[PDB]
């Protein structure tokens, strides 16, 4: 378990410990991949619904005459799960009110589209950088610990002076 104690264990068993750890590790990995596949699935699904909703909120905002109504739509469109679930009754009440079946507004929407496209690209880049950071970090920290174990190995000291 600690380095100093390794002298007392047997070599044939240390190999078995290594295989014990190798198989359990592949097991946890297959689990981890399962987990992540689920998280992305559900996160893409949730993304779609919230998008449908906040698109709706902004759409209907161009109609609400009351300043409470306008504030309602704006807050919802800020996209928070909680605040949406919690103000959904009033949101629906709003929707009941106004559903009973130019140029400057379309320019607004194209402006909306451009800024959102920028945001998406920004976030995609930042996603990538984060993956790289994770990689870098794991390599960095484990290198450091490997050194620490090499610095308290006395066998290393005598083999190498």
């Amino acid at each position: 378990l600690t380095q100093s104690d390794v002298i007392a264990f047997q070599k044939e068993a240390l190999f078995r410990c290594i295989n014990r750890r190798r198989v359990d590790f592949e097991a946890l990995r297959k689990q981890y991949e399962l987990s992540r596949r689920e998280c992305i699935d559900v996160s893409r699904k949730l993304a779609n619904i919230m998008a449908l909703i906040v698109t709706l909120a902004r759409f209907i905002e161009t109609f609400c005459t009351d300043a409470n109504e306008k504030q309602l739509c704006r807050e919802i469109a800020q996209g928070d799960e909680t605040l949406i679930v919690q103000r959904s009754d009033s949101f629906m009440k709003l929707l009941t009110k106004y559903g009973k079946p130019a140029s400057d507004h379309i320019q607004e929407l194209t402006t909306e589209l451009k800024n959102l496209r920028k945001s998406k690209e920004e976030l995609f880049y930042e996603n990538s950088q984060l993956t790289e950071e994770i990689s870098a970090l794991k390599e960095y920290y484990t290198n450091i610990i490997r050194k620490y174990d090499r610095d308290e190995s006395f066998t290393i000291k005598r083999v190498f002076k």
């Binding site: 070599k11 190999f15 290594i18 090499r150 083999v159 190498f160």
Partner: protein
């Protein structure tokens, strides 16, 4: 009896009074013309911490003729044929008699950290050494761990 067998004795003395770091070597207590050696792979080399066994076979042409050397431990190096033979320049065509066992083992150790894909003896090893460097490190690590048996 012969001068080759007292030169070998001189190398053996070197291997004790100034045994180079990370290597051991000793001829059979009966047969001086045959030596068990071993090399340890260096830090910050993909062969780090390995423990590779080596066999050296000597004839009466020593130190004029270098001995035959092969790893017994499984190996994965571009300058290593699958039978354990080595493609080192100071063994074939840059050998001098003033090289002893201690300088030979260490001239081999250097190959680990500094391979030579210029005279490749194991195709796969020199290949991954240029394509899938990470994967190459993986195979070398298998080598290292097996060497601890």
């Amino acid at each position: 009896s012969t001068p080759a067998r007292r030169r070998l004795m001189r190398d053996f003395k070197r291997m004790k009074e100034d045994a180079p770091p990370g290597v051991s070597a000793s001829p059979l207590p009966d047969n001086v013309m045959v030596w068990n050696a071993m090399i340890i792979g260096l830090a910050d080399t993909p062969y780090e911490d390995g423990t590779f066994r080596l066999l050296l076979e000597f004839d009466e042409e020593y130190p004029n003729k270098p001995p035959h050397v092969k790893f017994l431990s499984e190996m994965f190096h571009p300058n290593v044929y699958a039978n354990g033979e080595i493609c080192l320049d100071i063994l074939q065509n840059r050998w001098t008699p003033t090289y002893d066992v201690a300088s030979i083992l260490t001239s081999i150790q250097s190959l680990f950290n500094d391979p030579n894909p210029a005279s490749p003896a194991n195709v796969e090893a020199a290949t991954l050494f240029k394509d899938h460097k990470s994967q190459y490190v993986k195979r070398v690590k298998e080598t290292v761990e097996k060497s601890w048996e």
